[PDB]
């Protein structure tokens, strides 16, 4: 078994390009659990590369808080998983180590795993680890989970510490958890759902207690399906699987409602205004001067400081940096960026207006005639081939941006959202979504119907 485990690990690694680094001695309250960690979360014991030339042999002096908490709970870390470089991408194809391949299919198929937590999802789908940690900025835990036919939970923003979680877009970045087992996932969430004073965005102890104090018995549970997300071209098999799930729920006595949340439609343009801007800002530190890759010869060229080193950024990262800097320049800032922030506020307000649970961050009262959970597709597409994904992206950025149509609103509003599979080994999923802070409801609901 042990021998059989290592051999399995070597095989799937070789065929599917899952890890960026593996424990030298693999498999040697979460005591005995084995985890993989997305390679944008810093660790003392492994390099943290962000799948980037920029940080190709970077060794952090410290463990991310989530890594420390896991270790303290007795978790063994198998290795760091491959990812889209610096978290930028939706397909898992942008990495200095090459793309991750989806293990639901023969590796010859070169099917995409989805991104940015590609390796994380793959390591779970292969049964290499008990759970994986990923990050989700616009869908990057939920989408690859969906494509690996495993659970992918993105908790409420600020519940899990981002200390040591390398910055992509800080107002959106969230640590998330992938597993095949809802029980394991809840245990991991409970372990990691903690205030961290190192993280100025960590949800305070006071607000956590306020959230708990707001919980009420809900009878019956009220579930919404969202008009604006109910009309996309969906994969073959989806409607049957979707309708079977809703029927199962209706036969349990819960109530299902149509709900319209018009602001969800503008979420992609909102996201690609805010997120590239933050990205450009957060990547301004990379210069090879204090750490990471550094050009052997020049710290400046063409009157542009750090250009030679920074040229080693991946191509998708450069594109986004360029866009983000455009978005931040004075005139564009006063227009698109300010507008995007205001619309984001509108979105949060619309969600507040339809949820019974109060939002402690906006001090909404909760709508007593509102809803407990939303159910929304995770993706409108099946995983294609790496070539097809790469071809499509080359045609237009919009073709890639649309991949996160269903996931970005919950990122923008920081809502807890769990993608769950509908059929064994099938890259189709649904999200269960609750109000900000209402993580236990989402998880218990999913556990209840599992």
């Amino acid at each position: 078994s042990l021998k059989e485990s290592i051999e399995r690990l070597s095989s799937f690694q070789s065929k599917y390009n899952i890890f960026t680094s593996i424990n030298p001695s693999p498999y040697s309250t979460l005591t005995g659990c084995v985890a993989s960690i997305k390679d944008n979360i810093v660790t003392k014991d492994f390099p943290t590369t962000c799948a980037s030339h920029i940080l190709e042999n970077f060794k952090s002096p410290f463990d991310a808080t989530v890594v420390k908490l896991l270790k303290q709970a007795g978790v063994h870390i198998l290795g760091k998983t491959n990812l889209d470089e610096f978290g930028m991408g939706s397909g898992g194809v942008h990495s200095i180590r090459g793309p991750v391949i989806n293990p639901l299919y023969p590796h010859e198929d070169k099917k995409i795993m989805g991104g940015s937590s590609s390796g994380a999802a793959a390591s779970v789908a292969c049964d290499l680890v008990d759970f994986a940690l990923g990050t989700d900025t616009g869908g990057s835990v939920r989408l690859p989970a969906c494509y690996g036919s495993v659970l992918g939970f993105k908790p409420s923003y600020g519940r899990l510490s981002r200390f040591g979680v390398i910055a992509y877009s800080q107002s959106l970045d969230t640590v998330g958890i992938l597993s095949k087992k809802i029980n394991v996932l809840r245990k991991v969430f409970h372990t990691l759902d903690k205030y961290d004073m190192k993280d100025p965005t960590s949800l305070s102890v006071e607000l956590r207690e306020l959230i708990e104090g707001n919980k009420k018995v809900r009878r019956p549970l009220k579930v919404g399906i969202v008009k604006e997300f109910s009309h996309e071209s969906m994969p073959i098999g989806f409607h049957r699987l979707y309708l079977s799930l809703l029927e199962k729920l209706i036969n349990l006595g819960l109530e299902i409602y149509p709900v319209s949340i018009p602001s969800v439609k503008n979420c992609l343009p909102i996201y690609y205004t805010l997120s590239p801007a933050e990205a450009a800002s957060n990547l301004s530190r990379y210069d090879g001067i204090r750490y990471g890759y550094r050009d052997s010869e020049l710290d400046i060229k063409d009157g542009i400081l750090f250009a030679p080193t920074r040229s080693k950024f991946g191509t998708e990262v450069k594109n986004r940096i360029i866009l983000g800097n455009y978005n931040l320049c004075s005139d564009a800032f006063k227009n698109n960026f300010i507008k995007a922030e205001k619309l984001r506020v509108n979105l949060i307000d619309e969600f507040d207006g339809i949820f019974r649970f109060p939002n402690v961050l906006t001090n909404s009262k909760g709508n007593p005639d509102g809803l407990d959970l939303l159910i929304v597709p995770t993706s409108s597409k099946l995983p294609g081939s790496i070539r097809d994904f790469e071809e499509e992206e080359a045609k237009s950025p919009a073709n890639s941006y649309i991949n996160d149509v269903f996931t970005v609103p919950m990122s923008l509003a920081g809502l807890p959202s769990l993608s769950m599979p509908l059929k064994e080994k099938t890259p189709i999923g649904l999200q269960v979504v609750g109000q900000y802070g209402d993580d236990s409801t989402v998880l218990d609901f999913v556990e209840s119907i599992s």
């Binding site: 409602y257 149509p258 709900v259 450009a280 550094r294 063409d302 594109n319 866009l323 320049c329 409108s380």
Partner: protein, 125 residues
């Protein structure tokens, strides 16, 4: 604004609801800056001008921008006070955290740099 409808009574109401003639988001979303603009942008980005395919960046940015510029037409609809004692208390309770490397000399701050000169970081003119 957001609105909740009446509860579904049966699965066929849901099938009919899902089959209503309503735009997809794809349908709703309908799935160039000067070369000098791009050059300025490369500079702000700390990216090299040499080797850069300008027209290609012009082209990609153009499409990026028309996508996010959809916001131009969207109308906009429409914290605990730190007090004195808490101010003083916070000041009194601040301390250096080893987990932050805040204690002087507790780690080699230059030890991750590819190049250095003794305890200094270095930049080449």
């Amino acid at each position: 604004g957001a609105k909740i409808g009446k509860k579904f009574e049966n699965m066929n109401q849901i099938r009919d609801y899902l089959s209503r003639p309503v735009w997809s988001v794809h349908e709703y979303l309908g799935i160039p800056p000067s070369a000098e603009a791009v050059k300025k942008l490369l500079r702000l980005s700390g990216l090299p001008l040499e080797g850069a395919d300008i027209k290609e960046i012009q082209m990609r940015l153009a499409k990026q921008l028309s996508f996010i510029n959809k916001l131009h037409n969207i109308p906009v609809e429409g914290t605990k006070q730190l007090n004195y004692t808490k101010l003083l208390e916070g000041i009194s309770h601040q301390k250096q955290d080893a987990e932050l490397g805040e204690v002087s000399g507790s780690w080699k701050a230059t030890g991750l740099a590819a190049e250095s000169k003794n305890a200094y970081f270095v930049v080449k003119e």
